[PDB]
Amino acid sequence: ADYQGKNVVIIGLGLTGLSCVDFFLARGVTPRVMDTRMTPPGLDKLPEAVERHTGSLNDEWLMAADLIVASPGIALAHPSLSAAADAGIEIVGDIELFCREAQAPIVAITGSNGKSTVTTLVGEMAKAAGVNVGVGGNIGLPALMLLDDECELYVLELSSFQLETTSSLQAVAATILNVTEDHMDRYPFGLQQYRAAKLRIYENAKVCVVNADDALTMPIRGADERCVSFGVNMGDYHLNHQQGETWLRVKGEKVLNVKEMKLSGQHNYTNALAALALADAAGLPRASSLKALTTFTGLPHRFEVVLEHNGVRWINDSKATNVGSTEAALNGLHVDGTLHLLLGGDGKSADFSPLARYLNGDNVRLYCFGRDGAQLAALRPEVAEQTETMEQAMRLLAPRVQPGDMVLLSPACASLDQFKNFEQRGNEFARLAKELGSH
Numbered sequence: 001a002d003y004q005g006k007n008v009v010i011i012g013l014g015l016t017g018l019s020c021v022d023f024f025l026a027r028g029v030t031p032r033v034m035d036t037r038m039t040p041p042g043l044d045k046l047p048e049a050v051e052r053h054t055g056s057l058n059d060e061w062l063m064a065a066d067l068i069v070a071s072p073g074i075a076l077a078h079p080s081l082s083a084a085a086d087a088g089i090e091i092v093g094d095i096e097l098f099c100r101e102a103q104a105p106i107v108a109i110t111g112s113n114g115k116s117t118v119t120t121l122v123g124e125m126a127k128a129a130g131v132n133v134g135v136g137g138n139i140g141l142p143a144l145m146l147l148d149d150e151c152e153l154y155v156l157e158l159s160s161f162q163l164e165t166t167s168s169l170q171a172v173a174a175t176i177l178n179v180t181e182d183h184m185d186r187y188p189f190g191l192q193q194y195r196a197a198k199l200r201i202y203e204n205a206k207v208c209v210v211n212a213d214d215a216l217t218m219p220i221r222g223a224d225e226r227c228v229s230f231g232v233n234m235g236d237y238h239l240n241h242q243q244g245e246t247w248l249r250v251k252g253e254k255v256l257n258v259k260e261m262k263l264s265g266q267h268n269y270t271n272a273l274a275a276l277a278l279a280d281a282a283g284l285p286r287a288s289s290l291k292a293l294t295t296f297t298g299l300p301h302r303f304e305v306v307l308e309h310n311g312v313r314w315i316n317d318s319k320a321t322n323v324g325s326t327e328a329a330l331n332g333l334h335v336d337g338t339l340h341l342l343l344g345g346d347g348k349s350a351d352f353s354p355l356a357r358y359l360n361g362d363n364v365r366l367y368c369f370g371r372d373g374a375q376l377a378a379l380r381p382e383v384a385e386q387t388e389t390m391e392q393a394m395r396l397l398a399p400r401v402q403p404g405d406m407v408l409l410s411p412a413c414a415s416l417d418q419f420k421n422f423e424q425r426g427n428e429f430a431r432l433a434k435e436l437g438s439h
């Protein structure tokens with residue numbers, strides 16, 4: 001692709017938007033930037049020679065554009081963007097720009113849950129092989145910041161939103177890990193429209209890695225010649241359980257006793273399987289890939305023990321931004337005393353009902369907050385309190401905490417109504433836990 005002399009409009013700043021700005025300037029192209037937010041993140045970082053329009057979209061700029069570069073945080077269905085598409089004006093995102101330039105193979109990962117963990121694992125598998133790997137996308141650095149002629153492999157986490165604006169990805173190995181209800185605020189044609197966005201990841205992929213336990217991860221035409229599967233009891237990559245032990249297996253052969261992993265739990269074992277299938281498809285040596293599985297400690301905010309003190313475990317699962325993720329935390333959860341469960345934020349129009357089956361019995365307490373606090377409290381009103389903020393909920397629950405209890409932030413919602421991102425929510429939980437969890 002060659003952008004010289006084009007009128008380029010970037011919609012949405014933030015770090016993604018900033019990386020797009022830098023991309024064009026380095027190529028001799030001065031883009032214009034707009035954002036519906038008055039003072040979007042990164043505005044103060046925007047170069048002075050870059051024209052900007054904030055507080056609304058500017059239709060004069062949009063209709064004048066030769067290329068529109070849309071942040072994943074703006075819907076293609078926005079009437080302004082829809083009008084531009086109707087006019088035949090080309091719309092792409094940062095991942096599309098990246099794919100057109102990348103000079104190494106790309107492993108591409110998406111799905112409702114597990115995508116950051118699997119992305120990070122594949123990165124570690126590549127690092128263990130002594131491969132110069134760039135890992136990022138929807139996790140870590142925006143993809144464009146990874147572009148380097150000396151990179152030998154890219155491992156990208158791709159959101160459904162990023163995939164909607166991407167057309168030139170030809171992944172060496174691509175997966176949809178699972179599809180459970182999420183982002184319904186952005187998909188008014190429901191679960192299958194959300195699924196369709198993720199299914200794009202398989203277009204022109206050399207190998208497709210599918211979840212044998214989740215039909216929605218299969219291409220519409222069905223699994224094909226390119227399709228490798230992982231699963232619990234079935235799949236090319238699967239689990240073998242015995243007395244008190246679990247093994248990772250590939251086509252019948254044992255490859256790893258999971259006692260050697262630092263991660264635990266079934267969902268992390270299938271994450272390990274998915275990462276191994278991707279790593280194998282990418283040509284990484286099996287031995288170094290297995291070594292990576294034994295060294296990886298997990299990501300922050302992902303069922304992370306932030307304080308274990310006075311017989312109480314305080315767990316930061318702020319990365320649980322949907323119902324499926326909170327389910328993964330609650331399913332098979334052992335608690336000696338009472339579970340003090342923090343739920344809330346922007347629920348993105350999700351049906352929270354599937355959580356109700358995990359909240360029976362006398363040893364559960366719910367502390368519900370943020371935009372959708374009331375809908376979460378309604379799961380079991382008799383054991384629920386509602387506050388405005390997570391801090392209020394923590395100061396409410398802390399006096400009730402007894403030795404043997406668990407305090408679990410696993411909110412099933414986005415943080416964006418009250419926080420910058422789920423990382424900030426997790427960090428604040430950790431700060432408050434340390435204050436409240438000690439005399």
Ligand SMILES: N#Cc1ccc(COc2ccc3cc(S(=O)(=O)N[C@H](CCC(=O)O)C(=O)O)ccc3c2)cc1
Nearest residue numbers: 011012034035036071073074159321414415416421422
């Ligand atoms: N014009 C314009 C314009 C452009 C961009 C924005 C930025 O807003 C977002 C940017 C990136 C986003 C990414 C996502 S996401 O869905 O990929 N990730 C969130 C993370 C939520 C959290 O961190 O708590 C989620 O899973 O719900 C959601 C909303 C996002 C909103 C506002 C206005």
